[PDB]
Design a protein around this ligand. Structure first.
Ligand SMILES: *C[C@@](*)(O)[C@H](CCCNC(N)=[NH2+])NC(=O)[C@@H]1CCCN1C(=O)[C@H](N)Cc1ccccc1
Lengths: 27, 253
DNA sequence: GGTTGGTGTGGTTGG
């Protein structure tokens, strides 16, 4: 349902210190 | 994990640790894909060439961790298996094809700031995300080096999916389609790999479509930990969804 | 300690 959306990370519109490495991959 | 860092609280609500009853030790990682079923690799429960053959009996499941060590008092939650399902073609003898197992916890795990399931890959997401150079995020309480020592904390590493072929001339192991390698090339100037202890671990991705996260891989093998010229082999979770969803829709939660 | 370590009553939590 509400698979893979973190309760303290996407869930509160904050990102982790590295998430960002990850969407910069995809260009 | 090798050449990685600390997980920050709640980086991986999915990430689950498998851990021997007796002798009370950690055996692997799992990712819970829901309030009842967990995704681990099989070779964690069955490697006949080393006598790995655990049973529902033999294992313990603890959801919501961070400390490798302490028993995380009000966060972490410990469960009992009801049944394990290795994949019929699991191939422990040769090269480890469809090195995947499920195991249905005895009764449902409450969700929490710390416990949250991961997204299973879709046809579409599979298509768009699994591509060379694209990073993935692997996790856990594994050897900090090949051989020595281990973390007191979950380690997270950001590693790039490697070209289909390149994975290949890397191992005399006879590689397959239910396998995907992951790495920093030799000369790519950046390190990390999973390791002895790592296995069953999730290799996640985040669709910049909904910004949810997905399990692409599973930690499976490779030769050493961060050997130059060596890349960890995961389990094409996608490639195996079908069986993956046959059972949960069969005798599931 | 404790189903827990200690950076020791705080923290991802009691007391
Ligand atoms: C459970 C595990 O941790 C582990 C994953 C480690 C792989 N390392 C990296 N950096 N990706 N799985 C294993 O170690 C499996 C189970 C038994 C042996 N094995 C291996 O991966 C061996 N190191 C090599 C191997 C030999 C035979 C068939 C497959 C792999």
């Amino acid at each position: 349902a509400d698979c893979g959306l973190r309760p303290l990370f996407e869930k509160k519109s904050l990102e982790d210190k590295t998430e960002r490495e990850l969407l910069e991959s995809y260009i | 994990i090798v050449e990685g860092s600390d997980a920050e609280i709640g980086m991986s609500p999915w990430q689950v640790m498998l851990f021997r009853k007796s002798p009370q030790e950690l055996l692997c990682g799992a990712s819970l894909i829901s309030d009842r079923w967990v995704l681990t690799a099989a070779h964690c429960l069955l490697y006949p060439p080393w006598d790995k053959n655990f049973t529902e009996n033999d294992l313990l499941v603890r959801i919501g961790k961070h400390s490798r060590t302490r028993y995380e008092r009000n966060i972490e939650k410990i469960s009992m298996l009801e049944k394990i399902y290795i994949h019929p073609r699991y191939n422990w003898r040769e090269n480890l094809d469809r090195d995947i197992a499920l195991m249905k916890l005895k009764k449902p795990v409450a969700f929490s700031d710390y416990i949250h399931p991961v997204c299973l890959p879709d046809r579409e997401t599979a298509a768009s995300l699994l591509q060379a150079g694209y990073k993935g995020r692997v996790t856990g309480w594994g050897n900090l080096k090949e051989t020595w020592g281990q973390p007191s904390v979950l380690q997270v590493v950001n590693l790039p999916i490697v070209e289909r072929p390149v994975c290949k001339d890397s191992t005399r192991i006879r590689i397959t389609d239910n396998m995907f390698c992951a790495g920093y090339k030799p000369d790519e100037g950046k390190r990390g790999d999973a390791c002895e202890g790592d296995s069953g671990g999730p290799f996640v991705m985040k669709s910049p479509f909904n910004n949810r996260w997905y399990q692409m891989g599973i930690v499976s093998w490779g030769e050493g930990c961060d050997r130059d010229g060596k890349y960890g082999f995961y389990t094409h979770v996608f490639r195996l969804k079908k069986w993956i969803q046959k059972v949960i829709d069969q005798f599931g939660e």
